[PDB]
Amino acid sequence: PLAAYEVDDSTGYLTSDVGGPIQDQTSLKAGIRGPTLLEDFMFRQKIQHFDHERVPERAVHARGAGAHGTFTSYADWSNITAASFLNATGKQTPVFVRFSTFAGSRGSADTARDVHGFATRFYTDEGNFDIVGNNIPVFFIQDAIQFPDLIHSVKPRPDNEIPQAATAHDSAWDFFSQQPSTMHTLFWAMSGHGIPRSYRHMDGFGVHTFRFVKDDGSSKLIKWHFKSRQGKASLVWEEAQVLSGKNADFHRQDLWDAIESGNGPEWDVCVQIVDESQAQAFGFDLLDPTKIIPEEYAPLTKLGLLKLDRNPTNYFAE
Amino acid sequence: PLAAYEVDDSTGYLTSDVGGPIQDQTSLKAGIRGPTLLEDFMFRQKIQHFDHERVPERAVHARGAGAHGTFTSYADWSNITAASFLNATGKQTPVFVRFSTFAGSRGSADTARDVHGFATRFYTDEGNFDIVGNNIPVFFIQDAIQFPDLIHSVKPRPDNEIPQAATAHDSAWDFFSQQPSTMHTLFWAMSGHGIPRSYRHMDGFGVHTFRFVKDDGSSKLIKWHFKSRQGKASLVWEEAQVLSGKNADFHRQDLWDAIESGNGPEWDVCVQIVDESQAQAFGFDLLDPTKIIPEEYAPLTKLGLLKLDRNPTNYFAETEQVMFQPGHIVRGIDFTEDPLLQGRLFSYLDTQLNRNGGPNFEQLPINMPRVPIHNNNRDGAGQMFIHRNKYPYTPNTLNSGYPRQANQNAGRGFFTAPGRTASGALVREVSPTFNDHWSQPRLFFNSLTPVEQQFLVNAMRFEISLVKSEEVKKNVLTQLNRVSHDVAVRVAAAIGLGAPDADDTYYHNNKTAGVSIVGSGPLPTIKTLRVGILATTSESSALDQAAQLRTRLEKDGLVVTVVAETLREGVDQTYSTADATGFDGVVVVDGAAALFASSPLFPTGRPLQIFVDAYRWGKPVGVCGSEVLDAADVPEDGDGVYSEESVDMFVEEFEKGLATFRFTDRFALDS
Amino acid sequence: PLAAYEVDDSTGYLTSDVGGPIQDQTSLKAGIRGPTLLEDFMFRQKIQHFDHERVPERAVHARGAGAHGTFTSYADWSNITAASFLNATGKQTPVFVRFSTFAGSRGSADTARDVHGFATRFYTDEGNFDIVGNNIPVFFIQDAIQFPDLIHSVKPRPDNEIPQAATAHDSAWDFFSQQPSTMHTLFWAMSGHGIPRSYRHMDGFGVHTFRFVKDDGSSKLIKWHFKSRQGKASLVWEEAQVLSGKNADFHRQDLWDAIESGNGPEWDVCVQIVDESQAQAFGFDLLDPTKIIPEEYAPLTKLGLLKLDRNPTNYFAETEQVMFQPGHIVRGIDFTEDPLLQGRLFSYLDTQLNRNGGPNFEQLPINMPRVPIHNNNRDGAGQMFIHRNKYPYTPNTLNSGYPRQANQNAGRGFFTAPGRTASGALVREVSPTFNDHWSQPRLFFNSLTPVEQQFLVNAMRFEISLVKSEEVKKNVLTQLNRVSHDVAVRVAAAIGLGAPDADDTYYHNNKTAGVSIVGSGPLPTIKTLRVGILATTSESSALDQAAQLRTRLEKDGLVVTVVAETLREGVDQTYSTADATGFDGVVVVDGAAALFASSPLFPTGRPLQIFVDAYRWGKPVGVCGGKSSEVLDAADVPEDGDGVYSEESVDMFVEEFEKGLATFRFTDRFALD
Ligand code: HDD
Ligand code: HDD
Ligand code: HDD
Ligand SMILES: [Ca+2]
Ligand SMILES: [Ca+2]
Ligand SMILES: [Ca+2]
Numbered sequence A: 001p002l003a004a005y006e007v008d009d010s011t012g013y014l015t016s017d018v019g020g021p022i023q024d025q026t027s028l029k030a031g032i033r034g035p036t037l038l039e040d041f042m043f044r045q046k047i048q049h050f051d052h053e054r055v056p057e058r059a060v061h062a063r064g065a066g067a068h069g070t071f072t073s074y075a076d077w078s079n080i081t082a083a084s085f086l087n088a089t090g091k092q093t094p095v096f097v098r099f100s101t102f103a104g105s106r107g108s109a110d111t112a113r114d115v116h117g118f119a120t121r122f123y124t125d126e127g128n129f130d131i132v133g134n135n136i137p138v139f140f141i142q143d144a145i146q147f148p149d150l151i152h153s154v155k156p157r158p159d160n161e162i163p164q165a166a167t168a169h170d171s172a173w174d175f176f177s178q179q180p181s182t183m184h185t186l187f188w189a190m191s192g193h194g195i196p197r198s199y200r201h202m203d204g205f206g207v208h209t210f211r212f213v214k215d216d217g218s219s220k221l222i223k224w225h226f227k228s229r230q231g232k233a234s235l236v237w238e239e240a241q242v243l244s245g246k247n248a249d250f251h252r253q254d255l256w257d258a259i260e261s262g263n264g265p266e267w268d269v270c271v272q273i274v275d276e277s278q279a280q281a282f283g284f285d286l287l288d289p290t291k292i293i294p295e296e297y298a299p300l301t302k303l304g305l306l307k308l309d310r311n312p313t314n315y316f317a318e
Numbered sequence B: 001p002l003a004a005y006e007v008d009d010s011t012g013y014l015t016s017d018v019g020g021p022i023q024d025q026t027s028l029k030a031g032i033r034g035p036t037l038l039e040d041f042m043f044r045q046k047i048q049h050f051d052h053e054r055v056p057e058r059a060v061h062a063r064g065a066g067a068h069g070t071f072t073s074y075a076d077w078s079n080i081t082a083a084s085f086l087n088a089t090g091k092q093t094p095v096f097v098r099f100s101t102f103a104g105s106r107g108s109a110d111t112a113r114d115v116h117g118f119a120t121r122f123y124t125d126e127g128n129f130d131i132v133g134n135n136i137p138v139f140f141i142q143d144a145i146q147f148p149d150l151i152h153s154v155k156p157r158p159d160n161e162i163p164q165a166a167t168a169h170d171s172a173w174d175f176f177s178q179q180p181s182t183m184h185t186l187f188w189a190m191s192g193h194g195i196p197r198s199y200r201h202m203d204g205f206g207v208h209t210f211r212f213v214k215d216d217g218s219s220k221l222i223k224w225h226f227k228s229r230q231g232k233a234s235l236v237w238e239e240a241q242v243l244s245g246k247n248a249d250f251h252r253q254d255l256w257d258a259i260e261s262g263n264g265p266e267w268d269v270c271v272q273i274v275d276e277s278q279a280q281a282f283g284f285d286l287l288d289p290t291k292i293i294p295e296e297y298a299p300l301t302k303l304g305l306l307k308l309d310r311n312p313t314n315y316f317a318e319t320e321q322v323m324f325q326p327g328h329i330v331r332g333i334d335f336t337e338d339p340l341l342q343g344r345l346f347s348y349l350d351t352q353l354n355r356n357g358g359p360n361f362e363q364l365p366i367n368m369p370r371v372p373i374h375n376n377n378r379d380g381a382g383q384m385f386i387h388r389n390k391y392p393y394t395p396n397t398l399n400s401g402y403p404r405q406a407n408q409n410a411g412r413g414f415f416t417a418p419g420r421t422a423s424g425a426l427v428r429e430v431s432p433t434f435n436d437h438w439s440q441p442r443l444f445f446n447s448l449t450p451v452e453q454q455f456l457v458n459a460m461r462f463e464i465s466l467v468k469s470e471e472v473k474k475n476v477l478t479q480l481n482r483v484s485h486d487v488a489v490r491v492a493a494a495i496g497l498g499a500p501d502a503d504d505t506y507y508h509n510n511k512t513a514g515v516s517i518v519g520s521g522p523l524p525t526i527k528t529l530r531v532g533i534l535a536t537t538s539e540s541s542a543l544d545q546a547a548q549l550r551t552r553l554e555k556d557g558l559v560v561t562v563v564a565e566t567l568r569e570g571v572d573q574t575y576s577t578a579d580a581t582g583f584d585g586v587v588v589v590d591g592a593a594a595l596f597a598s599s600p601l602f603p604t605g606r607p608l609q610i611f612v613d614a615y616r617w618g619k620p621v622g623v624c625g626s627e628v629l630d631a632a633d634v635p636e637d638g639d640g641v642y643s644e645e646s647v648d649m650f651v652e653e654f655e656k657g658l659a660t661f662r663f664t665d666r667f668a669l670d671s
Numbered sequence C: 001p002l003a004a005y006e007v008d009d010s011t012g013y014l015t016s017d018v019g020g021p022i023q024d025q026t027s028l029k030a031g032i033r034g035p036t037l038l039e040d041f042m043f044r045q046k047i048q049h050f051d052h053e054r055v056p057e058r059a060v061h062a063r064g065a066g067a068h069g070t071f072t073s074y075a076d077w078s079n080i081t082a083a084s085f086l087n088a089t090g091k092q093t094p095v096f097v098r099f100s101t102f103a104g105s106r107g108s109a110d111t112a113r114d115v116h117g118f119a120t121r122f123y124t125d126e127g128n129f130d131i132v133g134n135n136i137p138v139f140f141i142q143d144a145i146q147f148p149d150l151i152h153s154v155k156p157r158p159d160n161e162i163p164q165a166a167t168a169h170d171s172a173w174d175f176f177s178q179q180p181s182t183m184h185t186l187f188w189a190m191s192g193h194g195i196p197r198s199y200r201h202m203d204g205f206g207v208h209t210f211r212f213v214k215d216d217g218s219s220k221l222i223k224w225h226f227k228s229r230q231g232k233a234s235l236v237w238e239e240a241q242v243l244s245g246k247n248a249d250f251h252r253q254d255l256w257d258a259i260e261s262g263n264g265p266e267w268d269v270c271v272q273i274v275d276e277s278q279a280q281a282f283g284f285d286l287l288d289p290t291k292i293i294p295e296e297y298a299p300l301t302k303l304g305l306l307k308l309d310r311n312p313t314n315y316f317a318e319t320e321q322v323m324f325q326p327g328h329i330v331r332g333i334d335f336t337e338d339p340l341l342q343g344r345l346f347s348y349l350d351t352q353l354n355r356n357g358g359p360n361f362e363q364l365p366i367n368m369p370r371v372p373i374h375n376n377n378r379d380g381a382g383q384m385f386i387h388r389n390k391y392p393y394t395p396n397t398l399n400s401g402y403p404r405q406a407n408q409n410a411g412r413g414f415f416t417a418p419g420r421t422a423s424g425a426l427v428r429e430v431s432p433t434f435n436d437h438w439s440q441p442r443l444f445f446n447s448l449t450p451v452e453q454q455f456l457v458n459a460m461r462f463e464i465s466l467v468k469s470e471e472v473k474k475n476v477l478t479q480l481n482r483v484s485h486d487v488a489v490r491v492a493a494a495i496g497l498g499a500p501d502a503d504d505t506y507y508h509n510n511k512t513a514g515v516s517i518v519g520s521g522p523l524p525t526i527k528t529l530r531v532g533i534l535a536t537t538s539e540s541s542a543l544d545q546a547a548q549l550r551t552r553l554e555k556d557g558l559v560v561t562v563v564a565e566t567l568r569e570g571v572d573q574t575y576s577t578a579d580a581t582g583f584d585g586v587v588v589v590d591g592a593a594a595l596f597a598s599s600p601l602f603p604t605g606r607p608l609q610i611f612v613d614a615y616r617w618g619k620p621v622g623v624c625g626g627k628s629s630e631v632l633d634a635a636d637v638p639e640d641g642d643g644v645y646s647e648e649s650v651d652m653f654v655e656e657f658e659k660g661l662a663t664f665r666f667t668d669r670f671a672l673d
């Protein structure tokens, strides 16, 4: 899929980045027990590269894992959207999905109690389309300007950076109790949805109401739901805690393994669709990201199938 | 110490970074249910800051914690070094220390099995001096150019980034078995030194040989040893694994708490001093960073006291941003031709460009010296100075020749030790003097106690059983067998391979003092150690028992946690949150016996699990007030098991057990 | 001012950045003729710093210069604005100003034909307030999203990066002719405003309509005008070209020198103030940044005095690192729905990440406010603060609800003008109120003097004749013709095409005051102006004459350069380094007549060339001593010419000459169509 960018090192002699053959195992020295020379460009190029390997971790969702796959549309959905990747029965579009926790830094445990990310890229024939979602269909806060307040409160206390990957401290609960919009997501995070059994055993939600827009300009309001075909399952807390120590990589390993064994996970990509005129028809505001539309009021339409079936080649690059 | 840079926000109205009062709770919208406006500068300034909060983590030692303190010189050391911070009895120099693991990213657990960093900055009156050390005195490799090979092999496999913070995978053991220089550090890491009980219960080492240089130009060779005054202690592996889940912040929390309670950790800062002529006199090469000098050949000299007694105010600003360099050297110290050291000097200057994003990293408060800076460095992103000198070149007349050159005879300049010399071809060759990779690993192993040796074998059994490649596993056995046949036999047994035939080239029976943990006697202090008292709210007698135990234990500086089903006055923690990993000793109060015989308030069996976990992990355990001990299957006649009606008799016994710290008779030995 | 951050190196021994004393003159080597060692940290720290000295130049206005100063309010302006720096008679606020060209990179010439920047920071007691203005009151385009298009077309062609600092190429005029909104600014840039005599002799404008907002919430619409107290003056093009070679630093030197000599430049900070209800009352839309309000409709109110009087200590730290934003706004001021202004607000915050390489650019000394900062911004690369508040989130109880929210009713908060409103579809559409691109360019042109109109026509003739594409040139003539048929005809004559037939839809005869340079009368002061006295060492009488003139002229605050073949006491520079571009007026002492009639000491004919150039460029020129005919005749300058002086009397000469310096340019020396 990214085959054109791949670099093969299964044969050949070591070179610099500019294709000059070199060695990289002993420094150049003035004598056999002597000081290392500044003119050793072999040493410096390799070590400079190493010194600069790291990049800033994501500001949130720093801990996560990804895979390639394919989306397949079940129908021509022109009746509800102009979107090209949905415009034909059987039409296939490559995807890349990253899953994650939320609070922890990039080496923290998969099985922390947290909100989880579920971010999907569709490389469509009319441009890249991302749905940047979570495993929980509502968010803590009602205005983006409050995002750093939330995140500051949930992340470790900033004098000592304790505790890692956890809401179980004064600041997070101070914020929750002072900012009551948080109640809905908090309840989700305190349920089993906070400790899913695997990325494969959770759903994905766009959270926000979006619009589907036809070529004639008419629009309808939608919510994205990615419904797991593996079922929904969770850990118990006292198991999660031990797991975080015994295998911090549990979720990424579970995903890697399922894909390698030919059991790549699948979701049904669904939307709830309602009219513009129903924005306040359900006893709340569809602009409010802390609310769900109960399925009794609006059923899921299944748009197509998302399957992940290919692991990355280089984790960092991809 | 950094007070000049502090910002107080305990009062006042919210402002922008340019002092304009604002709000930050609602976006500006076109109508009350409308879209957000581009002209909302309050939103964009706040969210832009947040968007850019993170900086790259350190390439290694990414997981760490720091503290401020003071170094105090014991003497005037002018007779061995010109170093100003060592030039008078009682002379004090502020320090900042960062401790760390090695392999893991930010957020990974403190109690991974790893090498640990112990990096110390002395803000001396003649410049910042850094000693960038580890808790293990030797390093894996013999040439800096191999560092990215070592690190790639030890860090997660790069297709899937698994596993985190662990050498327990094919690539690490492939490298170890192909690069036998790694044997000595590997044996250390597989010992209890890989899982210290805290930062405070480990030593620090400079690893390399450095030079002490006098004002008269003469030099001697030295090793730095920071010797803990809290004593040395370790976890056991099966405890550490659980701890990594239950509290990833265990070490940083232990350090923070010790300092906050007036129990700041101390080390004696020591050196071995030997003559230049003794570079090759001890059966190995002093330039070789995989070798120690046995203390039998060269005793330690105590130079002064290092104490940490002040926690940082902002972790990111101070701990995350502290940028250590072995290039931060002062007059009176010099480098050696250790090819590992040599290359570090390049690396630590370059790498801060990555972390800081620009060349003015030394201007961050935590990096600033405590004396005036006079040089012709200029410009660069993030330039914080306004330089008055508008002729920043040498030689000049238009600034009257300032700044003036400093050197051996002027301005207390740094100078390269003048006796130093180089001779021969310009070579990319390894000295044959480096070629013995096995003797000292065997020396180390020999110096551990029988049960210590078992722990090390068992760590290797654990890790090597997880290596998938049969050929790698065989290659590992080949190397271990060159250190010790018996080690190779015992680890081979766990992995269903045959050990190769004994190969006695490097076998011997010698021992060296000071490397064993379990052999180093009882801890010299038990202050800060954690006692969990397991009690119940269902009996008032239980709480009285716990309260009375608390009073007597806290007198002696122990941190006491009373556990019960629910919180109330006198109870610190619920059974739901309690774990044996959180305690150094565990006491059950007689009155709570029924609990150890179901509840919606904690997981089934939790109270007895704590007690049983603690026992099996080697901790002092007891009942104060045989019923409990039976249910636990813990023998009343066990060393480190206590059973007393009287609180005073119990405590007096139990505190002896806390000093012993681990009862190693509880662990099975091979054959 | 920024004294707290200053570093003194007038004494002491060289140290590293961490205070360890070192040397920095010889590398550490393995032997006296051997290789350099990696362990040489003295080498590496010094060279690393050097390697990383440079930062990205500004995306536009890369070429500029700055100074510190003070603003003094003339009144309590509470009646029109809540702004604290304007709230009392005599209230003083420190300022920093950077002036600039527009298109050129760093190291391009000050005296390119260009728009010029005039960016002012007020370090107010209620936060930093920036007015990021230009010397031309209108801009090329009507929507911020078009900025990169404008800038791409005006900057050098991207295959070979030619030409530098010039709109004189195809791509620029392709854009101008296809985007007629550009006409107004174009006409300005093609006038003398495109080549100002100095930063001190130009005005500053905010360009956009902004709002003044009172503490009661009512608002009015305003334009900022910074009016020079030095007078308005320009170079001529043929002079500016040579100057760009002889002294690329002319404007920055001019400004530096004026400040050092106690002649710091001043502006009256003014506004036009009109009602919200007049947004569309003046025959165009006040949201449209390509329009002026003619001052006949809305006169200037003088708010206070801006004076620049202190040069920077370190250019890079202060001038290069200053990071202006229109988003640096204070209570009492608000934005309008100017779609150009609207986008700027995003751009200036984002672009500082590129220049600074990180998010903490407001912590640079030149960027810091002069009041306490209280907020929950944290971390980021280059973080210079150590925050004590360990609960940086709102709402909190754990820091007792601090910091507190500031707004209209509490803590003197910024607030959006509450009368402000929006209505209608969410559209990517241009208001039809914006569609007249030609009438105001015509108004501007009408308001110039005849010779001034000729200068503008000639700048257009110069530039358009360098446009290679025939179709672009035709398209340019089309747009010019919609402003003025006469302009189209006259520019067309130079390039060998026909003008299109007159198209009178936007023609008119209206004029407006205060936009003309050559019409704005003699300069109000001649202090700082430069007089070159051409003398000779061959006659001791010539130097005596030069000395008498110097004394008389310096008394009146002129900067006097005595020029001769070689330096000595009394002579400031040699003919070799001297040029007419270096002077506002040129005097020959008649004792030096023989020079004007070969030397290894200067290029052939240099002395006469300086006098001839000065005359042809419109400057006051003269011969002092009584014998003028040999100099004047060699220069083909008529004794009876305006701005040509010939007196024996030193006193009489100076009195006359100084009136010529105030007149500044003698425009009778230029041919009209
Ligand atoms: C205004 C700030 C802010 C707000 C209100 C949101 N986040 Fe976000 N989110 C970010 C700021 C952002 C970010 C800081 O911009 C991140 C961090 C790394 C990145 O690329 O974007 C991001 C990361 C990001 C990731 C990781 C993507 C990946 O795997 O690389 C996911 C899945 C989400 N977020 C999901 C959401 C959901 C479902 C939201 C609520 C509906 C949400 N975020 C609110
Ligand atoms: C040529 C590469 C090189 C080699 C041979 C070494 N290291 Fe290193 N070390 C680095 C390159 C590196 C680095 C990548 O440059 C780091 C990462 C972040 C930094 O600031 O320096 C660093 C990090 C660093 C830290 C963390 C400092 C802190 O707390 O901020 C410690 C304690 C050490 N190392 C100690 C050692 C010891 C005792 C070594 C063997 C004697 C050693 N390193 C070999
Ligand atoms: C949306 C893009 C864009 C638009 C429409 C404008 N500019 Fe701008 N301007 C920038 C994009 C920007 C910038 C790229 O963001 C700069 C470059 C460096 C910086 O700090 O901001 C800038 C530089 C900047 C400077 C230099 C500031 C300094 O001295 O450091 C001045 C004086 C102006 N511009 C003035 C204006 C005027 C009076 C405008 C029309 C009314 C204008 N700009 C429109
Ligand atoms: Ca907290
Ligand atoms: Ca591996
Ligand atoms: Ca062109």
Ligand SMILES: [Ca+2]
Pocket: B357, C357
């Ligand atoms: Ca950068």
